[PDB]
Amino acid sequence: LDELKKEVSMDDHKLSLDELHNKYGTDLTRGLTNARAKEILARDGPNSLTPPPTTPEWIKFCRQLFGGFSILLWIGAILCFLAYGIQAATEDEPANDNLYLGVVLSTVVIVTGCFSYYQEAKSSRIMDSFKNMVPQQALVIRDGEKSTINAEFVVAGDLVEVKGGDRIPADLRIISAHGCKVDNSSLTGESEPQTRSPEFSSENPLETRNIAFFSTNCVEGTARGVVVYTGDRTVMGRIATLASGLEVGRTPIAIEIEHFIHIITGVAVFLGVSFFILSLILGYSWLEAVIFLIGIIVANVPEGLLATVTVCLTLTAKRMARKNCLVKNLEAVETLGSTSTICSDKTGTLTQNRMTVAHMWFDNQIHEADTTENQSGAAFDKTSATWSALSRIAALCNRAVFQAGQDNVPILKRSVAGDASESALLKCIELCCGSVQGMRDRNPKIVEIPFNSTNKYQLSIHENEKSSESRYLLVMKGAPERILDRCSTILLNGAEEPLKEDMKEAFQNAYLELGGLGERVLGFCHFALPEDKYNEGYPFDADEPNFPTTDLCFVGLMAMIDPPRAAVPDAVGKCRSAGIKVIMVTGDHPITAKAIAKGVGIISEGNETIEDIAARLNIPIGQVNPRDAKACVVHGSDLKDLSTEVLDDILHYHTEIVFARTSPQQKLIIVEGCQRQGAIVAVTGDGVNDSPALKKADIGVAMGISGSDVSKQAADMILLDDNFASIVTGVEEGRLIFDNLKKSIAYTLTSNIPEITPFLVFIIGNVPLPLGTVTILCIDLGTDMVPAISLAYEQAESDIMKRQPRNPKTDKLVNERLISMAYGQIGMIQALGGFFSYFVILAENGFLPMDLIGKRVRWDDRWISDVEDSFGQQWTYEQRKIVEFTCHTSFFISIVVVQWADLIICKTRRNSIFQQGMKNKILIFGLFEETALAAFLSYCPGTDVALRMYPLKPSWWFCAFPYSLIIFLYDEMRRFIIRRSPGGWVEQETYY
Amino acid sequence: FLGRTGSSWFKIFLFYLIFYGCLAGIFIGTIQVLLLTLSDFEPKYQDRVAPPGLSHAPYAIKTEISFSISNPKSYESFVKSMHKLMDLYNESSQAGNSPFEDCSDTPADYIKRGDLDDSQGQKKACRFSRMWLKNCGYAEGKPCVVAKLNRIIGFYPKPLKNTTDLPEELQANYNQYVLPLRCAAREKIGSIEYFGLGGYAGFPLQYYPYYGKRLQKKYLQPLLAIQFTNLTQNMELRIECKVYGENIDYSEKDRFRGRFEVKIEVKS
Amino acid sequence: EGPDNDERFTYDYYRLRVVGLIVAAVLCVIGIIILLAGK
Ligand SMILES: *[C@@H]1O[C@H](CO)[C@@H](O[C@@H]2O[C@H](CO)[C@@H](O)[C@H](O)[C@H]2NC(C)=O)[C@H](O)[C@H]1NC(C)=O
Ligand SMILES: CC(C)CCC[C@@H](C)[C@H]1CC[C@H]2[C@@H]3CC=C4C[C@@H](O)CC[C@]4(C)[C@H]3CC[C@]12C
Ligand SMILES: *[C@@H]1O[C@H](CO)[C@@H](O)[C@H](O)[C@H]1NC(C)=O
Ligand SMILES: [K+]
Ligand SMILES: [K+]
Ligand SMILES: [K+]
Ligand SMILES: [Mg+2]
């Protein structure tokens, strides 16, 4: 469906103005007829974007109500009402058991539904942001007259007019223009104004001057044009549809959840029906056969687990909110940890998005300035008298000014009225020479010649601030070579000197080096005009050369670039140390893209492209073995004629990849290419041209300050302070939460065994029921909750940023090793500790373990109010039941006591508690509150009716203590083996 | 295979065999020590049987014994359980001076055979003739229910003293030696008739305290036969038999805590 | 005692409940203290 939109567009900028009118039945001068425009409206439809059909929240909520655990809990809830119905008909049961348990279980499903619904959130308003880029109104020429109309009423063929400050209402063929410049950052991510004129200037319509696009704005001048595309058919309207239309897809974390749901659901249905038939064979009435099944359901399903996961995710997202990293989708909290490839935009993401002075060439020396936002570098020069001469030209031969009321904000961050290069120079001098306004007050400008297309230079004449002179100084800047052809002397370390071929060659060298760094280079020179030839009232003519512009003194060079953000180089290296592959994907030109790649460490030192090898060896590129080149730089124009299989080979064959001059669909294609190889991919960006890629990414991260509204709609995560170091933190947090989820899951599952085994022995042994159904829910929904959550606050056991990204195909959240430990080893020890306390309670009340076998028949018989114990005493029905429920209560408390040790062992997968310590305060809180809850549930009056919880005698609490301790020792010995031999036996069997 | 290789499948079996073996051996060990802390003659706790329960022979479907006099197999179900109990009170079961003793044919005081020790043989229990149960196949019309006080080791059932008012106000009040049992329904549409030891409507105190199964096997607890020769027919009659005493109490939950709940209906 | 051994069939479930609830409360307070050591 969207495969059409993933392709490069076709256009009609090649046609003549006249020819273009024939195609759209239009007038170049009079414009369309009121009738013809209305006709075309009904024909083509409105100049608007329609949002894609969404899934209502209704269906979204209910889709969770049927996912493995909820299905089993539904079967339980209904099976409760089943047994209740069968009762209400047969023998009038005045009880509330099956009825209430059926109500409780149905509530558990609904509430669990809210948790998973909260986790599976999708806040997407892509198409809405795009719609915000179409103006409310447009100016059209109809019947030879200009009028403002609803922009939706704009059709292909009419004559539109735009001017500085307004949004392009539709894709236009420029037919007339006067000084028109446009901001195409929507399509390129670059905000430098692009001229628009009627002349065709490139085969590529996205590069030609005679096309203006919807989603962009006119920055200055005026233009008229013929509408060629409207609504969904515009270049960026299609990007809108592509972006808004892209199928979301399941996250890595989501896939893991479903996976263990299958496992646990599997064992649940297995043991469920495996013992349902095992009971009927033993001659159990279907009346009972279902009651046992309900218990089996409740025992096997970890009722509180899915909600635990959600809370652990939420708590991890809260910590990241506190580092200026907003998470829109709870699952995106983990994806960053599983990320193996980052596709990053350059401008406004890796870079500050601001022309900044990078180097200066004066005194036959290359000086480097500090490009960082917060200025974390050092000085270059202050002493040289040459510097002050260059500094003066940079301030004086400059027409840029700071906007009013910025004195509060830092120099480099403040808004400037002017072109990017003049702003850069302004901020450079203001920083290291103080107020520039002061320099422009001490040296009043009397005449100037602003930068001309033809002159290729800008000159200014000022009253020298010096009192002993107060004469006229000439300054000029422009193209380095043009400035050179106008110089005779060079200000070396203070004093001038003739411009010999020697210094002239050093100039060329300096010029070539700076240009090689992808930096824009300017020349600077001045000339102190002779006093006798220029009186204090001498008039200077700016129109006609009234003053010399030759034999001037060359002062120096200055170079500039849109520099990396301070934290970016280090963040890139850190991603790469964690084994994450970092690719650059930018709408910017290749020379600039490549230079920043080396600056931030995308391309490491020494690595070459095929073009680099060819130039170094002075040989044809076809003569170069492409396998000798680990780095590559792909232009979008070449990308366009490559198949995906060939794109896949590029991705496979290079470690250091730069995709430059890419369109928005091309970014999507590169992302998909990476994913196709089985990689989890993150995208980082800030422009509307990142929207499709951000949507398709497993996780999209947008910049918060510099980011466009669209990009932040398309993302899963926002960096609110533009701190790229947050990606590094995000991946670290993502890995940590993945491990801690394992700990929390194992902990929760472990207590399933002591809830399952009592029901089994109840059938096979014919003893009184050791633990009840209600009692199970008091564990999974009550006591285990805070402890399970607390594992989310566990510190790393080792340097997680030192390991490679997990293999999502092999490294699962819940594997066989977890089940073996939780179900086969620790849970089994917990089961016994439960049974022990059960036998203790009964034996101390007169029913010794031996006489318990095959007694349930008489025990449950409501009409036998005289059962004989081991000592020959006789018990009524309600009397023995009180002891039985007291058994449920102590078995319950036994679970809590054995979960103490389990909580401590689940703390660490490898390390010892004596190494990791007990610095998790939430965990300790869990221990205290868990025990408080259990005690309250046993001793609070009335709980014997609502939950069948009975007061325990002090000695009862200590039954499971020896089992709780064996768990601690056992797991500590086991992990001691793991560490002592990384070989594999204990490791490959039990290492979560 | 599914998971691993044969070598791995073996090792995982050798482990869980030794592992579960140890766990079973430990579990058994903790059961040993538990038993080691307990007496053979007396349970550690008795507060959960404390107030004695009162149970009868007619096995009630739901605290009810409804049947038809004009039908044979209508009551043959209740006669099965009635027989089961009384079959134990046979004279052939109580033979010789061992381990039985002839006790007062009239309600007497308690009898202490020492302590809950094995320092003596089987503590000798009082004989009880089912022949003390006058009038009661059993009552084919108007049932002859048999009551019973639940056995509790070392329990001395203490009758109420005639200090103040009483339900069966002072009638045949053998204050010193009889634990009374008065059945009731207002709703007085019946005819209560009690049979027991010495002809009294109670339990003779000479059968106490019970020394337990280990120290007193073949022991016999006193019975109290109750006959309802009601002149009514074809209606559910809620009859409650209540025992009175200092150590006797009741509960709204446990409807068998020192009392009966019988729903007789001679639907004939 | 002899016939006056009523205490054998008695248990102070009332005190046990009072003590049990005291303990539960204090464990609840202790937990808050440790948690609130930083929020
Ligand atoms: C306990 O006493 C009952 C009294 O009914 C015995 O029942 C006797 O059963 C035999 C054989 O079935 C009959 O011939 C008699 O008529 C019954 N009564 C009597 C008085 O002998 C019963 O057998 C006795 N049980 C034991 C174990 O001795
Ligand atoms: C109540 C009692 C009788 C039930 C005992 C169940 C035992 C036999 C179960 C419980 C957990 C189970 C193990 C759980 C995990 C694994 C790892 C997997 O890669 C192979 C199977 C294996 C090794 C299972 C084998 C059987 C097992 C040990
Ligand atoms: C009980 O049986 C005796 C004979 O043993 C008889 O005289 C008497 O009438 C019976 N009593 C009743 C109330 O039927
Ligand atoms: K469970
Ligand atoms: K995404
Ligand atoms: K559980
Ligand atoms: Mg950008």
Whole-angstrom distance between the N-terminal and C-terminal Cα of chain B? 72
Q: What is each CA distance from A984 to A103, A973, A990, in whole angstroms?
A: 48, 15, 10
**Residues near A180 by beta carbon (within 8 Å), at least 6 away in sequence:** A162, A174, A195, A196, A197, A218, A220, A221, A222, A223
CATH class of A340-352+564-724: alpha beta
Whose CA is closest to A822, among A74, A63, A300, A311? A300
Find out whether A117 and A64 touch, Cβ atoms under 8 Å: yes
Enclosing H/E stretch for B239: strand B237-243
Q: In whole angstroms, what is the distance from residue B133 CA to residue B144 CA?
A: 10
* Chains with 3 or more CB pairs under 8 A to chain A: B, C
**Which ligand is in closest contact with the Cα of A722?**
7
Q: In whole angstroms, what is the distance from residue A490 CA to residue A526 CA?
A: 10
**Ligand 2 atom 11: the closest Cα is on which residue?**
A824
Identity of the amino acid at A627: R
**How far is the alpha carbon of A844 from chain C, nearest alpha carbon, in Å?**
14
Identical fold at B1-38 and B39-268? no
Six token digits for residue B25: 């051996």
**Ligand 3 atom 3: the closest Cα is on which residue?**
B135
Whose CA is closest to A584, among A632, A515, A520? A632
Identity of the amino acid at A494: G
Length of chain C: 39
Residue A141's beta-bridge partner residues? Answer: A146, A159
Q: Phi and psi of A445, rounded to 5°?
A: -75, 125
Per CATH, is A1-46+126-245 categorized as 2.70.150.10? yes
For the CA of A824, the nearest atom of ligand 2: 11
Enclosing H/E stretch for A140: strand A137-142
- The full DSSP string for A502-544 is HHHHHHHHHHHHHHHTT-EEEEEEEEE--STTS-TT----TTT
Q: Do C9 and B158 touch (CB under 8 A)?
A: no
Find out whether A340 and A816 touch, Cβ atoms under 8 Å: no
Nearest 5°: the CA angle A757, A758, A764 is 85
* Residues of A with a known catalytic role: 345
Find out whether A768 and A884 touch, Cβ atoms under 8 Å: yes
Give chain B positions within 8 Å (CB) of A872: 151, 153, 210, 212-214, 216, 219
User: What is the SS3 assignment for A208?
Assistant: coil
Six token digits for residue B34: 């538990």
Exposed e or buried b for every residue in A892-911, given b needs 16+ CB within 10 A? bbbbbbbbbbbbbbbbbbbb
Q: Phi and psi of B260, rounded to 5°?
A: -105, 165
- Edge-to-edge strand order for the sheet containing A717-719? A325-327, A717-719, A699-703, A681-685, A341-344, A581-585, A656-660, A631-635
Six token digits for residue A414: 């403040």
Of the candidates A836, A879, A962, which has its C-beta nearest B53's C-beta?
A: A879
Q: What is each CA distance from A279 to A77, A271, B222, B238, in whole angstroms?
A: 21, 12, 41, 38
Residue B146's beta-bridge partner residues? Answer: B225
Q: Do B150 and A824 touch (CB under 8 A)?
A: no
Residue A227's beta-bridge partner residues? Answer: A172
Six token digits for residue A724: 């790229």
Q: Which residue has the tokens 């023998």?
A: A91
Q: Do A879 and B254 touch (CB under 8 A)?
A: yes
Identity of the amino acid at B226: I
Per CATH, is B39-268 categorized as 2.60.40.1660? yes
Q: In whole angstroms, what is the distance from residue A660 CA to residue A597 CA?
A: 11
Whose CA is closest to B110, among B126, B121, B132, B98? B126
Six token digits for residue A305: 């687990």
Angular region, A899: left φ>0, alpha ψ -120 to 50, beta rest: alpha
C3 near B CB under 8 A: yes
Q: In whole angstroms, what is the distance from residue A290 CA to residue A655 CA?
A: 61
- Domain(s) labelled CATH 1.20.1110.10 in chain A stretch across 63-116+246-339+725-992
Best residue for ligand 2 mutational test, from A752, A762, A812, A820 (most atoms within 8 Å of Cβ) = A820
Give chain B positions within 8 Å (CB) of C7: none
Six token digits for residue A938: 């046993």
- The neighbourhood of ligand 6, an ion, using CB within 5 A, equals A 302, 751-752, 780
**Residues near A527 by beta carbon (within 8 Å), at least 6 away in sequence:** A473, A474, A548, A551, A552, A553
Provide the residue ranges of all domains of chain B, joining segments of one domain with +: 1-38, 39-268
Find out whether A746 and A352 touch, Cβ atoms under 8 Å: no
Whose CA is closest to A610, among A589, A595, A594, A632? A632
Q: Within 10 Å of residue A431's Cβ, how many Cβ atoms?
A: 16
Q: In whole angstroms, what is the distance from residue A102 CA to residue A98 CA?
A: 6
Exposed e or buried b for every residue in B201-221, given b needs 16+ CB within 10 A? bbbbbbbbbbbbbbbbeebbb
Q: Tell me whether the omega of the peptide bond preceding residue A302 falls within 30 degrees of 0, making it cis.
A: no
**Residues near A385 by beta carbon (within 8 Å), at least 6 away in sequence:** A491, A493, A494
Breaks after residues in chain A, judged by C–N over 2.5 Å: none
Residue A224's beta-bridge partner residues? Answer: A161, A176
Six token digits for residue A721: 């302070």
**Ligand 1 atom 3: the closest Cα is on which residue?**
B87
Whose CA is closest to A372, among A139, A531, A141, A566? A566
Residue A749's beta-bridge partner residues? Answer: none
Q: In whole angstroms, what is the distance from residue B242 CA to residue B260 CA?
A: 7
What residue spans of A860-980 are helical by DSSP H? 877-905, 913-916, 921-939, 943-946, 961-980
Per CATH, is B1-38 categorized as 3.40.50.1110? no
- Domain(s) labelled CATH 2.70.150.10 in chain A stretch across 1-46+126-245
A939 near C CB under 8 A: yes
Q: Phi and psi of A525, rounded to 5°?
A: -150, 160
Whose CA is closest to A511, among A519, A398, A392, A358? A519
Find out whether A329 and A679 touch, Cβ atoms under 8 Å: no
**Residues near B226 by beta carbon (within 8 Å), at least 6 away in sequence:** B144, B145, B146, B147, B181, B183, B192, B193, B194, B195, B241
- Domain(s) labelled CATH 3.40.1110.10 in chain A stretch across 353-563
Q: Which residue has the tokens 């969770």?
A: A64
Q: In whole angstroms, what is the distance from residue A125 CA to residue A51 CA?
A: 9
Give the HSE-up count for residue A631: Cα atoms under 13 Å, Cβ half-sphere.
Answer: 19
Q: In terms of DSSP bridges, do strands A445-449 and A416-417 run parallel, antiparallel, or are they unpaired?
A: unpaired
Q: In whole angstroms, what is the distance from residue A34 CA to residue A159 CA?
A: 12
In this structure, the dihedral spanned by the alpha carbons of residues A961, A963, A967 and A972, taken in order and rounded to 10 degrees, is 70
User: What is the SS3 assignment for A300?
Assistant: helix
**Fold of the CATH domain A353-563:** Calcium-transporting ATPase, cytoplasmic domain N (3.40.1110)
Find out whether C39 and C32 touch, Cβ atoms under 8 Å: no
Six token digits for residue A195: 């001229």
Approach to solving: X-ray
- Report the residue of A925, A943, A944, A950 to disrupt the C interface, i.e. the one with the largest count of C CBs within 10 Å: A925
Q: In whole angstroms, what is the distance from residue A425 CA to residue A522 CA?
A: 10
**Ligand 1 atom 24: the closest Cα is on which residue?**
B87
What is the CA A266 to chain-centroid distance, rounded?
34
